[PDB]
């Protein structure tokens, strides 16, 4: 996260770290959506241009964390993966369309002050909140700058951007399964996700019921925090029918 701040303890209790077993390293962010299911970006698990195709036994999920590098004894919980599910129409060849994946845990994780699931949006919450200018929150342990790494989880609040501005900021073909967020050059303020934040959540706090909803997944960008560029996020609601089908069929 560029131009963010340290998270408060328990501020993002759905935060998940995707962790490679060997070598032991951070791979991506992710989010907890139930006691057995974790949501992430497909490109965190499958990206053939970079020879990336992880299997379940390659990975661990670390939940309840604050420090990036410490083993947070008596606080974090480490879970093994039962199965990975990647969206069948995830477009890794072109533009990362439908950049979404689910991970089912081998055993349910115990909720605590530090571990708690985020809600997924209904159609009405999505329609009400996914408006240009409305702000969401992005969290992660990724790099602090494009060109270093944080001691603890970082947080930044960023406004959703009008779709024509998103489209005009890039040569990549944007789809309805993506949205973009960030400040414009004339707005003064700054902030973006960066390398290592991929797969983590873009959340919004509903003013109707005071619950946090995951509207986006950190998907892609061109650099980090560049003027005139915006971060792109998987549109969770538009892919929720697939999420539900997976959980109903395999949960």
């Amino acid at each position: 996260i560029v131009e963010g701040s340290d998270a408060e303890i328990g501020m993002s209790p759905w935060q998940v770290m995707l962790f490679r077993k060997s070598p032991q390293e951070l791979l991506c962010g992710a989010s907890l959506i139930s006691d057995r299911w974790v949501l992430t970006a497909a490109h965190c698990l499958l990206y053939p241009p970079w020879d990336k195709n992880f299997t379940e036994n390659d990975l661990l999920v670390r939940i309840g964390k604050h420090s990036r590098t410490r083993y947070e004894r008596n606080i974090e919980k480490i879970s093994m993966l039962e199965k990975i599910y990647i969206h069948p129409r995830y477009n890794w060849r072109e533009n990362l369309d439908r950049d979404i994946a689910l991970m089912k845990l081998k055993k349910p994780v115990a909720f605590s002050d530090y571990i708690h699931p985020v809600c997924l949006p209904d159609r009405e919450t999505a329609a009400s909140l996914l408006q240009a200018g409305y702000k969401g929150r992005v969290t992660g342990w990724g790099n602090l700058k494009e060109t270093g790494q944080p001691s603890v989880l970082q947080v930044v609040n960023l406004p959703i951007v009008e779709r024509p501005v998103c489209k005009d900021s890039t040569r990549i073909r944007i789809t309805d399964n993506m949205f973009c967020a960030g400040y414009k050059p004339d707005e003064g303020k700054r902030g973006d996700a960066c390398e290592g934040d991929s797969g983590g959540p873009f959340v919004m706090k509903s003013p109707f019921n005071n619950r946090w909803y995951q509207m986006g997944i950190v998907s892609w960008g061109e650099g980090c925090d560049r003027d005139g560029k915006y971060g792109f996020y998987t549109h969770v609601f538009r892919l929720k029918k697939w999420i539900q089908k997976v959980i109903d069929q395999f949960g």
């Binding site: 060997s22 032991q24 951070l26 661990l60 590098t69 410490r70 083993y71 480490i78 093994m80």
Partner: peptide
Amino acid sequence: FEEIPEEYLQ
């Protein structure tokens, strides 16, 4: 990164 308990790597 601090080493994690071996139980999670087995």
